[PDB]
Amino acid sequence: ATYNVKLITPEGEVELQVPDDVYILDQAEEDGIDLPYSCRAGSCSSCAGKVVSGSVDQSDQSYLDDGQICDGWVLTCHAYPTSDVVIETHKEEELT
């Protein structure tokens, strides 16, 4: 399955199509979008962002506790979509 993703970068919005078996940041990159990252194995803070709407399968991250997941925080480098989803990026400092 492929679903719509809308990214609210600090330099405006941009949308794109992501297969539910591909990590989100992976896509953004081939689609020429510059999103912050570091580890690319889901136990850091660089790719941080916030879920506005829609759902994700970020099972296999390890950095966030449940209250941050509860708070709609997401690690882009290790998030697959399970629905059409809107997301703010460049949110590390906000988490920090």
Added chain:
Amino acid sequence: KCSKKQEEGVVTNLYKPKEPYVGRCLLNTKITGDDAPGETWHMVFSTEGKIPYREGQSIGVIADGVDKNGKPHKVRLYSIASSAIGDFGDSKTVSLCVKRLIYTNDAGEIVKGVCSNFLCDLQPGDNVQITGPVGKEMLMPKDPNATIIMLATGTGIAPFRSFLWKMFFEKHDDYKFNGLGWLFLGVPTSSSLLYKEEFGKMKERAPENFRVDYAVSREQTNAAGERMYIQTRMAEYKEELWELLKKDNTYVYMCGLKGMEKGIDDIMVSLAEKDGIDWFDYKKQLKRGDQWNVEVY
């Protein structure tokens, strides 16, 4: 959606009205004085550990006998009074708090509640048909440093019994409380004042972690010379309360008699428009935050 209320292990509708667990009556003690207007009993049942209930739930009772149509009576629900572990602390036991429904109508005719009267009437050894457990609405917070405000009137103290037992009487490895448990309980008489010596023993072993307040409508009035209703006693702290209402770890629970909340809402209205706030919209919001939780009948 992940909730701020412990949802782990909680089971529902394990037995239904078609196939109720048949349990058995162990105790049954009147807990109101003799002068008391209404009469309210505290009862415990044998469960065989077969109903792993959790603090705040409620169960169903199929009263013995049939309606006019040869058909069973309808399930009545009663807020579970004992903690998970039961009153005996062995988890083979459930406890109910029941007021005997008896009124006179306008023809002089003494009317009695089917289930309420069936239950107070139970003797050690009688059988009870049991549905449940039921309700997710009144589960404890996950936060063991929570501010937990409990408003109760009459047999709406039941779940909060269940709450406190766990909090103050019991030792759990996974669960040690250390916030502030504030309780408001409103009643007619000092003879309708349920479980008081217990809450005493608590206030006695956790002075700063527990705060109680009672409201005897027919034996106290305020500085303004009006009957002490739950709201009236609360109004005596309209400060800390309103304050505590803006914290993230303050969770409110209201239980008891349909109508109490008009009383309370009215008090909150004047406190809200103080900050320029509309109450119901702040209400809603707390609710979305699972921070306001209501179970009245």
